[PDB]
Design a binder for these strands. Structure first.
Length: 58
RNA sequence: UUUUUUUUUUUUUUUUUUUUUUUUUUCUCCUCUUUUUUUUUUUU
């Protein structure tokens, strides 16, 4: 009963689609985008992703 | 004492040509464990 709900609440997209650069210059300048290096744990390597300014990416 | 006649190896040579490696499939796919991540230092 779960199965149909998870498979029909997934549609036809797997990852957020990217977008142009002029957006990213502006979003930096206006001050709504930080940017740093990104590393991952290695005991847990599908969950514990870090965004060196640390931002936890789950 | 036994004469005379019954052809034979197809004829021919003095014709133009402006393309080009290959060639045509097989789907989506659960990476298990003390961690933040350690870090100067000196002898190559």
């Amino acid at each position: 009963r779960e199965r149909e709900n998870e498979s029909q609440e997934s549609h036809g997209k797997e990852y957020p689609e990217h977008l142009p650069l002029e957006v990213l210059e502006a979003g930096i300048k206006s001050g709504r985008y930080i940017q740093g290096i990104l590393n991952v744990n290695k005991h847990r390597a599908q969950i514990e992703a870090f965004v060196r300014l640390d931002i936890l990416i789950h």
